[PDB]
Design a protein around this ligand. Structure first.
Ligand SMILES: Nc1ncnc2c1ncn2[C@@H]1O[C@H](COP(=O)(O)OP(=O)(O)O)[C@@H](O)[C@H]1O
Lengths: 788, 789
DNA sequence: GGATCATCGAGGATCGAGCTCGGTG
DNA sequence: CACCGAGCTTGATCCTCGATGATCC
């Protein structure tokens, strides 16, 4: 090993060292001319992650530095790979003037690209939330906070237990997860993506309160109703500090925080969320999910918002009623609204780039286009007699000042980057128009010169061209090169051409580049100026984008409710579910022939249903569709049924069927209430004769008589059909099956009472089993059936 | 839409539409300068499959032509993406010089890259078989053939029924599958990859017999013992014609064909193959598979061969005994052999590229390196008292003539491609040495000219460089450019440099170019010449590579047997399995908590074992370890046990682990199982009601015991079936106990006689932390029902 | 029909600062 | 005796020649 003390290294490597010292463990994109160079294990790692060239740079103090570098103009395709990989990156830039820097130029880490704090369009997934979360454990319980950097949506929670925390982890699904060093239950977290171990002092309450009050500009957090959540504030404080470190600027879009209380939303355990296949089927794909069907939103921001609504069913009936009324009122206006809403696009993530001062020309172009739709939206909504519509129409705003600003400032279709100019429009700044006049005098001036010089010289091959390196020139063919006027000054020789410069041309070249340099520098002044003019209205713009997004969701759900023939569910104060011709919203759309609709009647006098009938009969589907109907009822959406009356639901507990089973069941029985919805799916793996059955008789008895939760208890055990005999508030239903020889047809139709027989025989007869074996099974069944 | 008729297009585009007509449905890599361009539908699909630039050609024919292209020197990495997606590609090349062609230059489809016919190293997966297969359906039965284009392994079969065909499909797992137009049961092949629909006349017997006899140079196929397989020959005939069509070349490595007979191999259905996790766990991954553990072979060729052996367990006792004896004789020699075998590498797929005349420089280098190891292998095997070892040592050969040839011909480490020459070594060819001596003697002249011109001019920045377009030049800095001698003729100006030429430099440039062009052209003559000298010994080299591959498998299994402490299984004439301290070969290695070994006694007096107890990955494992032990016993390998006696096994049925799929697998077992069959039933009847599930399991257990009399390990939760041994003979009760003590449970993976006498679903629920009232309710209600039993 | 005129690919230096060597006045 | 003036150091990016075919009045 060579001696690598601070003094022995070169001045640029010493500058790299202290910047790298403030980011020891993450890759440092070090701006070096036109290339973000990395060094040592950052270069060799970058080389392996990005598939780029690992070169080296000569050092005079032992080890030549392992070097890997990326052009500043191709940096995003390599960050895309890293951000996909759950990798944090600090972007160091050249700041100062090279002409007045004898040693290394002034450099700064201006932003850290992390998997939960990315705003750039190309890095993010169009229709997926990308949330940066913080978790924190105490002796008492858990403290949690999630921030959508690209909307400024910062939410909080204090999960009571380990099981609730695992349900919140799965619900939110953080892209980057900050956790404290004294975190005990590592089993919840270890193996999750974007895992960042941080010190304890980052989770200090006094620093958190100060930082959050400062950010919101409030005296206390009484206004937000999070003053009495010290656990959740500790997480939010660590998160905000991390967010202001990954940007090293103010986050003005973060003006508010809301608490997601246990009684505010329906708490669905990890199994339920997976079993219902909300945004993720059990295989991990996005096909045959509740999102894929319900999500026909015309904006990605609405897509996420609807997907956000699906993840968290709201229990506040007032919000739900307003959505139900709205969906009903807008159902007639969908055709006219959707094509207008479609043009708005992803305005949410554009405002994030405005707030972070990272917005690109076409972000401002789409924002301008979004404002141009507001009048047509305001016009089409004015007649809709609905208080919530008029509330979101007022919240929508106008922004006539900002609409005029962008219309004057920016051209119709600017390029991707301001770097190469041509973004600010003509008339806005008449100094800029003057600087451009010289730059765009080339079409006539240099063409006029070409004619004069061609006619004057009498060299027919004479043509005026430009070259990025050498600048402008007069080009003559090799054959006619020696005949050039003596006033022509040799500049560039080519294989079959000679390129010259004349006093009038070098005057032009000197002035056309100094004009470009001025025009370009002023454009970037006027560009950074637009942020100064737009940031003050960010509050109104966020509420506007939030209102437009919410409109897209409810216009979509209005389209879906009409197209797929859904109805409005009504609410009662006490527990119960009365469905009439209820369907599975996903399965009926994916399988291309009519799904068989079924009713439901759950009440305190009829709270448990013992569901018999054959497997692959849609027994599991019927219980799922109920939870999905309950989900969609408590997102404020219309439901796939002819009629639904539903009571308050605090939790949905689902067990689909070993160790994990009995564990999930125990969690259900402990934490379930009368208001809880329970779906038991033939849960049982008995290690003896009735070991499984005996447990399902005692679990069904407990749920019915002790907890008294609304339950759909699907079971293959035929002995459980004797529970209604001895237990009150327990009833038998079954999915009918029709035997017709060596085959069986599944009706998928729920009937009262227990199924006439079991169909293990029928399934075996369809397997094509020898007749003596079948006749033996029919004989031996009647022997054992005789025992009861 | 604008008219794209044949006449309106350019002669070049007409030449594309000519050759594209002979390949209507597959992507055509059209060589266009230094780019394999595609056009119209081919360019937009390629753009979407490869993630390349979809560009356009300015045309005289209406719609501007959708164009997508890849450089000729980068073709492979893009073919890799296509052939692993199951995409066939025709590679069209420029053959003539375009400058002396009045119309478009003469072009040719030299090879078709198809998923089952890839010869190139980069396209193939190192340690996975890539079979081109042909299937046909007849009024009589099924006809099948598989070709490993790389190994020269040509196989055929006439699967007995629909079930055997599905088992053969899954076993072979063809990369490309040829099937006839009158193929009825499409359900067998419905979702399979690389599906090619072909006409029926390609499956004509007289054409097949003629083509196969021609290829092997035989009068009849009596020699191969495939003369009385008309169905299998029809498939093989269509397959050979397709293989010749894809290469457009003779296949001299295809000299032999072997039949996969029904009585030669243990028939395992698709479920068994998946459930045992041989090369593929149920999740589809390569981890916790029999291959991943047993495959410590030092060559990919050996890796595939061992993997091929695992897929097809042989019943010929003579082959197994030779492997068992060999593995035993190699045990003490392993340490010295494996590092030598490791250097051989993938010689099998290299010989494929030799036979197809597609071999790349480093393929010839690794072949030379493989020959250099033969003497050391032959030396270390010399004393091994084993007829099969000495048989494979003789079959190995020497090739001292070919070893010397390649040592003289080719340099130590050539580049990846012949394109830029520098492959043929100095001394081999006196003409080559002359063409290079001029190329390097000009290089030293032009370096000496740099010194002369530097001293003469007095310009310190003066530097002699080279450029593909310009050739050579003299480079001076912009500051010192005007001081250049007047005889210096400016050619190229740069930002801070000027490049010149003199008649003395272009005299020397004329020598370097003519030296290059001749040296390069002659190198490719001497390169194509090496194939002419090597092809004649291909038969001996295939037998050599086959012997080396087989040695690597048996050296590996000898290493594994010694390292993992396996023993040699002995065979009896009638069915039975007597294991002493048998282990699961995978699970014991993956979990570093020491595995609990157990015996087995299956016989006609003890055919069915009713296995009770908590499963906890010890009941399913115990049944699967038996099938794996039976697998490894009939691959000729040592087995994870202290002693094993095993009888003949014709099939292995595993319904271990949708309830409809279970009853389907079970139905297939009961229909086709014999006394020689091994059956593993894992708590079937789970999904349907208490009584109906039990009723089926009773009927199935009674049928298997009394009617079929197959060797069965019948795992169940149903405790009523533990009364079967009371009634009838050849049925016995065993169980895995668990020991309750406080707030913990010890799950014993140790097999005991009799039926389990306790419930532990209560105990596991009590550890889950279930309320005691619910537990006591379950125990209360159980004792009410169990006391009546 | 024959000088004239597209068109796609191949290299290729540059982009641009920074450290190091090399004179150098 | 410091101080200018050269070297080369990652993937895009024009840029121009190469090589070729196409052209059409
Ligand atoms: N009510 C229904 N109408 C039509 N098809 C249905 C219905 N219920 C279920 N199915 C179909 O049957 C399949 C099996 O349903 P599932 O609830 O999984 O059955 P089980 O739990 O009995 O195995 C579903 O994928 C769906 O395609």
């Amino acid at each position: 090993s060579a001696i690598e003390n601070f003094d022995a290294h070169t001045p640029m490597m010493q500058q790299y060292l202290r910047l790298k010292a403030q980011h020891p463990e993450i890759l440092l994109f070090y701006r070096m001319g036109d290339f973000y160079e990395l060094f040592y294990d950052d270069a060799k790692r970058a080389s392996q992650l990005l598939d780029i060239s690992l070169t080296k740079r000569g050092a005079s103090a032992g080890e030549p530095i392992p070097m890997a570098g990326i052009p500043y103009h191709a940096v995003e395709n390599y960050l895309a790979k890293l951000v996909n990989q759950g990798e944090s990156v600090a972007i160091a830039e050249q700041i100062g003037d090279p002409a007045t820097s004898k040693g290394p130029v002034e450099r700064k880490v201006v932003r850290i690209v992390t998997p939960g704090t990315i705003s750039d369009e190309a890095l993010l997934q169009e229709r997926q939330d990308n949330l940066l979360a913080a978790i924190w454990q105490d002796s008492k319980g858990f403290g949690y906070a999630t921030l959508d950097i690209s909307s400024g949506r910062f939410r909080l929670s204090e999960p009571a237990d380990r099981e609730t925390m695992a349900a919140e982890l799965q619900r939110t699904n953080p892209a980057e997860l900050l956790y404290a060093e004294d975190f005990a239950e590592m089993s919840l977290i270890e193996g999750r993506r974007g895992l960042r171990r941080r010190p304890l002092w980052e989770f200090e309450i006094d620093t958190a309160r100060q930082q959050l009050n400062l950010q919101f500009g409030t005296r206390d957090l009484v206004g937000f109703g999070v003053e009495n959540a010290p656990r959740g504030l500790s997480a939010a404080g660590a998160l905000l500090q991390y967010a202001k470190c990954t940007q090293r600027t103010t986050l003005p879009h973060i003006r508010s925080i809301t608490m997601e209380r246990e009684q505010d939303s329906i708490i669905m355990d990890a199994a339920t969320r997976r079993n219902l296949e909300i945004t993720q089927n059990l295989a991990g794909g996005a096909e045959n999910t509740l999102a894929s069907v319900l999500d026909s939103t015309v904006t990605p921001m609405g897509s996420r918002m609807l997907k956000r609504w699906l993840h968290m069913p709201v229990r506040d009936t007032r919000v739900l009623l307003e959505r139900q009324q709205t969906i009903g009122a807008l159902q007639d206006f969908t055709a006219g609204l959707q094509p207008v809403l479609r043009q708005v696009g992803d305005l949410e993530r554009i405002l994030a780039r405005l707030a972070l001062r990272t917005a690109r020309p076409r972000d401002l172009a789409r924002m301008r286009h979004a404002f141009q739709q507001l009048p047509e939206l305001r016009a089409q909504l004015e007649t809709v007699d609905s208080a919530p519509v008029q509330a979101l129409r007022e919240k929508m705003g106008e922004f006539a000042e900002l609409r005029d600003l962008l219309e004057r400032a920016i051209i119709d279709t600017p390029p991707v980057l301001v770097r190469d100019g041509g973004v600010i429009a003509s008339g806005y700044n008449e100094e800029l128009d003057e600087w451009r006049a010289l730059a765009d005098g080339a079409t006539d001036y240099l063409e006029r010169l070409e004619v004069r010089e061609r006619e004057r010289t009498g060299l027919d091959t004479l043509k005026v061209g430009f070259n990025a390196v050498h600048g402008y020139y007069i080009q003559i063919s090799r054959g006619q090169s020696h005949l050039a006027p003596i006033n022509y000054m040799r500049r560039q020789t080519l294989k079959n051409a000679e390129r010259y410069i004349i006093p009038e041309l070098k005057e032009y070249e000197d002035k056309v580049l100094t004009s470009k340099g001025k025009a370009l520098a002023l454009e970037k002044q006027l560009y950074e100026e637009l942020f100064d003019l737009l940031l003050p209205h960010l509050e109104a713009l966020q509420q506007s984008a939030s209102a437009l997004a919410e409109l897209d969701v409810l216009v979509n759900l209005a389209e879906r409710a009409y197209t797929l023939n859904y109805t409005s569910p009504t609410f009662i104060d006490k527990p119960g579910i009365r469905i009439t011709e209820g369907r599975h919203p996903v399965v009926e759309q994916v399988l291309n022939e009519p799904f068989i609709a079924n009713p439901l009647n759950l009440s305190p006098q009829r709270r448990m249903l013992i569901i018999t009938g054959p497997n692959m009969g849609g027994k599991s589907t019927y219980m799922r569709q109920t939870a999905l109907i309950a989900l969609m009822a408590y997102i404020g959406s219309y439901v796939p049924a002819q009629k639904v009356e539903i009571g308050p639901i605090d939790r949905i507990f689902t067990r689909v069927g070993f160790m994990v089973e009995m564990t999930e069941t125990a969690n259900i029985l402990h934490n379930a209430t009368e208001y809880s919805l329970v779906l038991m799916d033939e849960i049982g793996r008995g290690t003896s004769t009735y070991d499984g059955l005996s447990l399902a008789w005692a679990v069904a008895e407990n749920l019915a008589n002790k907890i008294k939760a609304l339950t759909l208890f699907a079971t293959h055990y035929f002995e459980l059909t004797q529970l209604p005999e001895k237990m009150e508030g327990v009833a038998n239903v079954h999915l009918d099956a029709l035997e017709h020889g060596d085959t069986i047809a599944f009706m998928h139709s729920v009937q009262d009472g227990a199924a006439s027989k079991s169909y293990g025989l029928a399934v075996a007869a369809l397997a094509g089993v020898p007749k003596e074996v079948i006749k033996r099974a029919r004989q031996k069944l009647r022997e054992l059936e005789s025992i009861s």
